[PDB]
Design a protein around this ligand. Structure first.
Ligand SMILES: *[C@@H]1O[C@H](CO)[C@@H](O[C@@H]2O[C@H](CO)[C@@H](O)[C@H](O)[C@H]2NC(C)=O)[C@H](O[C@@H]2O[C@@H](C)[C@@H](O)[C@@H](O)[C@@H]2O)[C@H]1NC(C)=O
Ligand SMILES: *[C@@H]1O[C@H](CO)[C@@H](O[C@@H]2O[C@H](CO)[C@@H](O)[C@H](O)[C@H]2NC(C)=O)[C@H](O[C@@H]2O[C@@H](C)[C@@H](O)[C@@H](O)[C@@H]2O)[C@H]1NC(C)=O
Ligand SMILES: *[C@@H]1O[C@H](CO)[C@@H](O[C@@H]2O[C@H](CO)[C@@H](O)[C@H](O)[C@H]2NC(C)=O)[C@H](O[C@@H]2O[C@@H](C)[C@@H](O)[C@@H](O)[C@@H]2O)[C@H]1NC(C)=O
Ligand SMILES: *[C@@H]1O[C@H](CO)[C@@H](O[C@@H]2O[C@H](CO)[C@@H](O)[C@H](O)[C@H]2NC(C)=O)[C@H](O[C@@H]2O[C@@H](C)[C@@H](O)[C@@H](O)[C@@H]2O)[C@H]1NC(C)=O
Ligand SMILES: *[C@@H]1O[C@H](CO)[C@@H](O[C@@H]2O[C@H](CO)[C@@H](O)[C@H](O)[C@H]2NC(C)=O)[C@H](O)[C@H]1NC(C)=O
Ligand SMILES: *[C@H]1O[C@H](CO)[C@@H](O)[C@H](O[C@@H]2O[C@@H](C)[C@@H](O)[C@@H](O)[C@@H]2O)[C@H]1NC(C)=O
Lengths: 639, 642
């Protein structure tokens, strides 16, 4: 977060920040605790706490009722699930204090206060701050070293909603269970019913189809993108050749004019014995061929105590990890050829590598290969995930007394700020943005706010955003509407709104037993005479069975769009491959603010493979562009 | 130097700094392995224009061009003819004033480094770095090259510096085992002195044996090295709550928390690689090392064995001068070492936690004379007490070339840095030189000798506890042969009241009394004086030494010293005497009255007997004021001279 808000174009001059006061008057809850004494959680520029708030600072182990402030305004923890499970347990950290790190990291990403002069062992240096630097923090810890319990999770969410939180951020997910057994979904439904939007991670079991979790209609489901940041061990050869490779070695290693060797017998870097046969290992650099297992090469290299290693690799796994315990660089295939060449055509080939360099990459963003993919096996009906946000190697606060990274085989390091990857990092970005949107428009519903963020998202990086796993254009099942564009989201022109009743009607059309229905609903609605699955959503999915012959299919979607800008819009269409689409009316006229207008989209398609297209309502006498993606998809095994 | 000027009490409010403008109008030359110009210490952010007086060049060379200078680094010159003449076949890789070693960059920043924000030695000693004289001008003269260092090049560098009109000279080099007329630094220094330029030189690091110093010449400011009050911590906490502030300089934020500790006499020696290789799960276990007089070997065996960490029991002063700490660990004293071992023996599942990158400014006592700081008396010239003065020289933080080996982690990882910790009289001298330079800026007419006088008679012989400064090698009171007059006290030195002055002619007369052949005489004096009808060894010096042969029977001896003291303050002083053990001293007159630059002479007389170097002093304390002019006295055997 020393760059992330810049990457999002956020700034004090104009856009969401000024409009929202950096979220000072809004409150975002974060469902493993927090390390309160971190700089990210101090309150230097914070105005008084809004009267509305009455949340507690619940005492516990190494945590007392004065631990809160105008920034970290609430702290609560929920451990009854653990105890009920086994009253024999001694909970070491019986409070909201974080002993894992995940909770601290997420909290600072979403609403970390400005923190000067931080870095990840020299990388990504600068001032850290949350996407919403003045948003209020309410911590709810349900994850403990001794266990994490579904019911505790739900108890935490319910307490947060009950506390009057403006937004909820949760970087957890469960798979393989139907909605009426899905903890986060059950609680989210409740949150939505009460006007609180929930941001949750899509999960990290990508890139296989339908691999995401938290894919519920009443949740903002967030996928993870790379930013334009990179970390360098600049590689210079004895012949002047200079290459900006990749490195995250956590110290200013000194490797200058050292002997480089390339030996096919060991070039694999998979044999400890072989590597142990290179003389003067401590002053020599070895080249490692691409063998699809970098982290094993790094381990063998680290164990053998080589000066450094040059790794040839383009495996996306490499660029999401901060594990770099031994000096070395990673280079792509072409570059790897240049290097090997230099070595073979020389006696006395040498190399120099420097570290702790950080640069601000094309193209970006890119969908992380491991970001889980739609459609939702919780509910195929509605396209997921919703939106893309930065989640690869993000810098945020961290507990000073836990393992952070490693040097050599025997040295562990700790830190105040660490780089971390995952949809876990992305979600809190969205949550903060959502919170600022809500501060700018205090009347906007959870659904409208998700709408602003979506129809305003950018699907381009100026080409279509790529999927890192295959290098082809990302789908809405990869990135939803696209990369969050906070500033635009401030002024979307049209929003696809929805009400609590609308979700009840949706839940109702699912045809669960009334007991299952009650499980999810539980006390926000009763068993519901107007079932309706066509929930007013800012995106479109068209599904097709794969059980037998494929035949031309057709689908019709009804949408209502309210004007938040008098204005008129013309629909522009781009039909998914091998399909046709049509809308009606083709034009929407608006007399004045708040007026609502409906339309119907119709797709005619055939299955076999997920094709994409879209529909944009572009303003004729203005610069508003309301975009909604469209995707066809097979009908897959649901939970 | 993130603390060092604070340790010396220097500040912008009052004292030497304001009085001198932090040395902005003065110039100090560093006879060097050169310099790394692009360092933050050598930028010119607060620097006024370069004084017109200066006409020194920015001599081009390898990777160094004529624009490499600025209002801070105002001069750069190098001298390599000695190398070439010795062998024209040589290819000098860095043929310029650019530093490829580091020593020169370190010394330069210590003496006149500009304020540099947010620096540290891998997390230790963090803060703003600055020279003892943050606005002094730098003139670099490089005579030391990777391919060689030549006496004649050294002399050529000094002469060029004097010729350039430098105000002060700093040189952290020394040679031993040679008579004055073969002593390069002395020869050149005589020339510098003759022309009103004081030379600060290190006393050397072959202490603590007697007469081990170099640069012990009457016309040189000979500087010894002290510890400061700074310490570096791996706080050690045991599983039983016991918390110990041990010593550590591991160059990263290692994470060692609640780890298993073992104490096993069979390997507690930490000298067997094989033995240590027998401890299972070495990567998660902490081993205790007994005191065996060779810590650095223990550290090597531990590092090679890849233990989580080690707890070293040691009080060896060698440990506290080194930044070599490639593996997590702590060093504890003997008592603490007992507590730890106890805890371990009386427990199953003993554990420990160590944290790093902690730095404290609380140490008592300080300063302390470094065990390795070379000791008087001068085998160059027993006649005059050496060294002259004490200054911070142990683990000093200063600039360093970014592209050279700095320190180490594990057996295979080398690190580099912009600012490094370094120990030795090498670090002390540039401290004195900067102070001398500021004194000269405050009093533009003061001679080199007067300035050395101000620094000496104003030096403090007591430590932060108000006891007499200790010798780290034995823990007894330091001698003037260990620390000269004592620890520099810049602010006081600004207003000494009385100075023991001297003139170029005075040194000629001294040189003359040495009775060298006239060729030898010419070697040293070369062209500043001619072969000298008023020989005189009683050089007007701010200290006293009384020598006694050890060749046979010891018999009551007597010595008389004549001193002249000029008043730099109308005032009157009464002499207070403290006679060295087993001896008597007397002065006359016992009182000095001053009407208004007036000069007044007196004679000190010691009656002593040899056997062992005893110390005493003579202080001229002002009756109607707060001036105190102190001069140490020391008896000494007469040892083999060079
Ligand atoms: C949870 O903490 C308890 C203390 O609050 C532990 O029992 C206390 O444990 C002491 C440590 O062995 C023991 O000296 C005390 O007699 C005992 N007394 C009480 C009432 O706390 C408990 O440890 C378990 O129960 C104790 C009594 C022993 O039987 C241990 O062997 C058990 O592990 C702690 N529970 C756990 C699972 O750690
Ligand atoms: C390339 O790969 C191997 C790295 O271990 C080297 O072979 C090994 O050489 C060792 C002595 O250098 C020897 O003890 C090992 O038995 C041997 N291992 C194997 C699998 O052969 C090889 O060195 C070359 O080949 C060996 C056999 C000797 O003939 C050496 O003199 C050769 O340099 C490494 N280097 C090269 C240039 O192939
Ligand atoms: C001193 O620098 C010279 C020029 O850079 C070196 O001579 C040159 O070395 C090159 C590499 O061997 C070679 O391509 C050039 O033809 C050669 N000659 C000239 C005029 O440049 C010189 O290297 C030494 O002398 C050469 C001729 C070889 O015999 C080497 O063995 C020598 O090292 C450098 N001298 C040294 C001591 O490095
Ligand atoms: C203290 O150190 C001894 C030397 O390392 C340990 O003995 C060594 O134990 C190894 C297995 O632990 C074994 O492979 C080595 O051959 C043996 N070496 C020597 C010189 O004794 C000893 O460990 C104890 O005694 C040994 C023989 C085994 O029986 C272990 O199980 C014992 O712990 C050391 N004793 C310590 C921890 O108590
Ligand atoms: C003298 O050395 C300086 C130091 O670089 C040269 O200036 C640099 O030139 C490079 C071009 O290769 C630039 O990238 C650096 O930023 C320049 N820095 C500046 C502002 O000096 C300078 O050009 C050299 N002059 C000559 C005549 O060689
Ligand atoms: C709890 O918070 C911190 C963390 O332990 C404690 O240091 C506080 O100690 C007590 O309050 C502070 C303000 C100080 O006066 C100290 O001396 C007290 O013991 C504690 N704070 C409170 C409000 O209990």
């Amino acid at each position: 977060t020393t760059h992330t808000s810049d990457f999002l174009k956020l700034n004090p001059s104009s856009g969401l920040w000024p409009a929202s006061g950096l979220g000072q008057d809004v409150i975002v809850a974060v469902l493993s605790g927090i390390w309160p004494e971190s700089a990210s959680f101090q309150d230097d520029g914070m105005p008084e706490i809004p009267k509305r708030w009455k949340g507690i600072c619940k005492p516990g182990t190494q945590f007392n009722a004065s631990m809160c402030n105008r920034k970290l305004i609430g702290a609560n923890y929920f451990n009854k699930g653990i105890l009920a499970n086994d009253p024999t347990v001694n909970i070491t950290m019986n409070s909201a204090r974080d002993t894992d790190g995940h909770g601290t990291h997420c909290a600072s990403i979403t609403a970390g206060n400005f923190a000067k002069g931080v870095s990840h062992f020299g990388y990504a240096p600068g001032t850290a701050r949350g996407v919403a630097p003045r948003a209020r923090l309410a911590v709810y810890k349900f994850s403990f070293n001794e266990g994490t319990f579904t019911s505790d999770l739900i108890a935490a969410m319910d307490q947060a909603v009950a506390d009057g939180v403006d937004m909820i951020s949760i970087s957890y997910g469960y798979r393989f269970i139907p909605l009426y057994e899905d903890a986060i979904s059950i609680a989210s439904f409740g949150a939505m019913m009460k006007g609180v939007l929930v941001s949750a991670s899509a999960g990290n079991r990508g890139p296989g189809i339908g691999s995401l979790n938290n894919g519920s209609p009443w949740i903002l489901c967030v996928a993870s993108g790379h930013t334009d940041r990179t970390f360098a061990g600049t590689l210079t050869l004895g012949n002047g050749l200079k290459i900006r490779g990749w490195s995250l070695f956590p110290a200013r290693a000194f490797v200058r004019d050292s002997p480089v060797i390339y030996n096919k017998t060991l070039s694999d870097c998979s044999s400890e014995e072989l590597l142990s046969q290179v003389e003067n290992p401590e002053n020599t650099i070895v080249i490692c061929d691409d063998n699809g297992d970098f982290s094993d090469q790094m381990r063998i290299i680290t164990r053998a105590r080589l000066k450094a290693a040059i790794f040839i690799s383009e495996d996306p796994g490499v660029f999401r990890s901060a594990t770099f315990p031994n000096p070395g660089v990673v280079v792509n295939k072409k570059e790897g050829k240049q290097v090997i060449n230099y070595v073979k055509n020389s006696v006395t080939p040498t190399a120099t590598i420097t570290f702790q360099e950080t640069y601000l990459t094309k193209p970006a963003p890119v969908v992380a290969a491991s970001s889980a993919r739609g459609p939702s096996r919780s509910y195929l009906g509605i396209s997921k995930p919703d939106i893309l946000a930065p989640g690869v190697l993000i810098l945020a606060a961290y507990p000073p007394n836990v393992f952070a990274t490693s040097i050599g085989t025997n040295i562990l390091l700790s830190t105040d700020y660490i780089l971390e990857s995952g949809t876990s990092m992305a979600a809190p970005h969205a949550a903060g943005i959502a919170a600022m949107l809500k501060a700018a428009h205090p009347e906007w519903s959870p659904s409208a706010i998700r709408s602003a963020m979506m129809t305003t998202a950018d699907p381009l990086d100026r080409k279509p955003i790529k999927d890192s796993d295959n290098n082809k254009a990302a789908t809405p099942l990869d990135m939803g509407a696209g990369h969050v564009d906070p500033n635009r989201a401030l002024d979307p022109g049209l929003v696809y709104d929805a009400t609590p009743q609308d979700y009840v009607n949706l839940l109702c059309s699912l045809n669960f037993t009334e007991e299952q229905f009650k499980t999810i609903a539980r006390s926000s609605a009763s068993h519901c005479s107007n079932p309706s699955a066509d929930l007013n959503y800012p995106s479109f999915i068209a599904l097709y069975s794969i059980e037998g012959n494929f035949t031309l299919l057709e689908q019709k979607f009804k949408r209502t769009v309210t004007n938040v800008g008098a204005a008129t819009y013309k629909a522009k269409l781009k039909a998914p491959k091998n399909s046709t689409i049509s809308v009606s009316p083709q034009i929407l006229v608006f007399k004045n603010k708040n007026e609502k207008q409906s339309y119907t989209l119709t797709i005619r398609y055939i299955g076999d493979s997920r094709n994409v297209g879209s529909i944009t309502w572009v303003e004729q006498n203005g610069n508003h562009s309301v975009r909604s993606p469209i995707v066809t998809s097979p009908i897959i095994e649901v939970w």
